């Protein structure tokens with residue numbers, strides 16, 4: 300029994316070992332309680348404003364849409380304390396951990412932005428934080444490893460499997476299944492077992508709420524479409540949520556196409572995988588014919604995951620949101636373009652969203668369209684990766 | 695499920711508990727795995743718990759993670775596991791065989807079809823590690839339609855509703871978890887909680903087998919003394935495989951001595 304619906308159509312659920320069910324039910328109960336507690340909400344709001352820096356700016360691009368009929372705004376989650384949208388829901392979950400009498404935090408991280416967010420919230424609120432990170436990601440997102448450790452978090456390299464995000468998720472869940480009496484698992488995306496996809500959406504939904512108020516103020520109308528990258532689903536559902544019932548507003552999610560969908564080296568299960576059960580949820584998965592979970596691939600550590608949150612699977616199924624893919628090369632071009640023409644260095648994850656919006660404009664340059672891209676993070680963590688690539692080329 | 699019922703009636707007549715080893719099918723290879731399993735049975739295993747290699751075994755610690763990896767290195771697939779199961783059953787008509795599954799492997803190309811394959815090959819139970827009772831309906835329904843016992847877990851902090859659900863939904867045996875965490879020999883579980891054992895009996899649950907961290911004969915005896923119908927050991931058995939990869943003969947000899955000792959402890 301649960302207080303809230305664990306499913307979005309066919310997708311979602313609580314596919315965890317029986318041992319973990321009480322922890323999940325306790326968390327769901329604490330969340331329902333907190334949502335109606337004015338003191339919780341006032342604490343959370345105060346942290347978001349005075350600590351994390353909300354509301355974040357909505358920036359109109361001035362250069363990258365020149366000569367077309369596209370108006371493009373960037374929702375500036377890159378300006379959030381910590382440098383990505385991940386900080387929003389970590390503040391709410393950290394308060395929940397305290398509400399439940401937990402003094403320890405476990406988190407997985409890929410891009411290291413959720414790890415940094417987990418570390419900073421734990422430093423602030425007096426929690427002991429341990430972070431699992433795939434060994435490949437420890438290298439390609441190294442600046443975030445230094446940031447986490449400076450903030451007093453234990454960072455545990457994971458060498459198993461692909462040594463990337465899915466393997467970090469696995470280790471975090473295994474750890475929690477033995478440590479749940481004292482540790483809260485601060486899952487960093489809108490995926491995993493209920494109640495996580497629900498909690499993460501509700502603790503990220505200020506992104507779309509602000510976006511709506513800001514675009515109305517500046518344009519006097521809703522966007523034609525909002526566009527967001529999808530690694531597990533949190534920044535995209537945070538942007539989408541407040542627009543779901545605005546039927547004219549397109550919701551476009553961008554999966555990583557990696558080296559090209561045809562290569563099999565990608566992270567786009569919503570459009571190219573099939574329904575399976577893994578990481579506590581029933582959701583689209585990259586899997587073998589026999590049902591082994593496949594290793595994903597993206598240039599972006601934050602997108603490199605072989606599944607996706609169930610609410611996106613559901614929104615896709617009913618046609619409410621559309622999902623597309625962007626390759627490593629497309630993301631890199633969008634990264635360079637934003638740096639050179641708008642003076643903003645985006646996260647490579649966010650650059651997938653930007654790349655799709657640039658394609659929408661370039662493909663149909665006389666189509667009148669008002670677009671918002673969720674600029675989920677800044678690209679400081681990616682600068683060494685991108686430099687090395689552009690050098691191995693000649694740019 | 696009948697093979698469990700017969701086993702437990704026999705063990706009760708002998709005033710004996712069950713000893714049930716776990717191994718991963720096809721670890722370290724198909725032919726060696728088949729010999730390993732023959733040695734477990736010859737040494738006195740009352741039943742088997744057998745893992746189908748899975749890419750992401752989230753209830754398992756490093757020892758059994760590594761067993762899965764060795765099986766994959768040998769190219770072991772679920773289809774080959776079913777080929778092995780046919781062979782095992784053909785040699786050993788009465789031993790109960792339980793599979794340890796992850797949900798994706800059962801759900802993959804149809805839940806019904808999975809349990810049908812189990813019945814066809816002569817498997818007796820299926821334990822799906824990442825399906826709690828709350829998500830179990832289509833699995834347990836398909837199991838029972840195909841005369842397979844669905845196995846459910848009674849954790850140390852199980853409340854009364856859970857005890858009642860587990861007693862009603864499960865067949866064959868009830869899995870009595872010794873502790874939180876993942877599989878592992880190093881992490882020893884607590885004594886069987888007597889109140890859980892007693893409550894399961896009150897609710898006419900399938901007989902309890904204690905598992906997780908059972909790695910010594912002393913723990914087997916303690917499990918039976920506490921009122922459990924037996925004990926499962928996995929990592930301790932798998933460690934002997936891992937230790938002896940270069941010595942197939944020494945592997946089997948050591949598996950034999952260990953299993954014999956574990957089984958003797960169940961007679962106490």
Ligand SMILES: O=P(O)(O)OCCNS(=O)(=O)c1ccc(OC(F)(F)F)cc1
Pocket residue numbers: 316317716743744753754758794821822823824847871876877878879905906907908926927928929930
């Ligand atoms: O002796 P150990 O510590 O290796 O434990 C061996 C257990 N092997 S098993 O197949 O019974 C087994 C049983 C249940 C499991 O997960 C669940 F509880 F979540 F369902 C995992 C493995």
Ligand SMILES: C=C(/N=C/c1c(COP(=O)(O)O)cnc(C)c1O)C(=O)O
Pocket residue numbers: 382383384385407408409410411412413414464487488489528529530531532533534535600601602646648649675676677
């Ligand atoms: C996996 C991580 N990051 C994901 C991420 C994503 C994708 O995750 P969501 O789908 O949950 O937003 C998008 N943008 C940025 C800046 C990100 O850092 C992480 O920081 O651990």
Ligand SMILES: c1ccc2[nH]cnc2c1
Pocket residue numbers: 301302303304305
């Ligand atoms: C479980 C709990 C609450 C729900 N609301 C709608 N469906 C549900 C299932």
Ligand SMILES: c1ccc2[nH]cnc2c1
Pocket residue numbers: 434435438461462
């Ligand atoms: C794949 C690629 C790079 C890595 N660095 C450390 N482990 C790895 C695995």
Ligand SMILES: c1ccc2[nH]cnc2c1
Pocket residue numbers: 407408409413464468486487488490530531532601604
């Ligand atoms: C996918 C999976 C797990 C995650 N944790 C943080 N972001 C994620 C994306």
Ligand SMILES: [Cs+]
Pocket residue numbers: 364365366367368369370
């Ligand atoms: Cs324009």
Ligand SMILES: [Cs+]
Pocket residue numbers: 529530531554555566567568602603604605606607
């Ligand atoms: Cs993904």
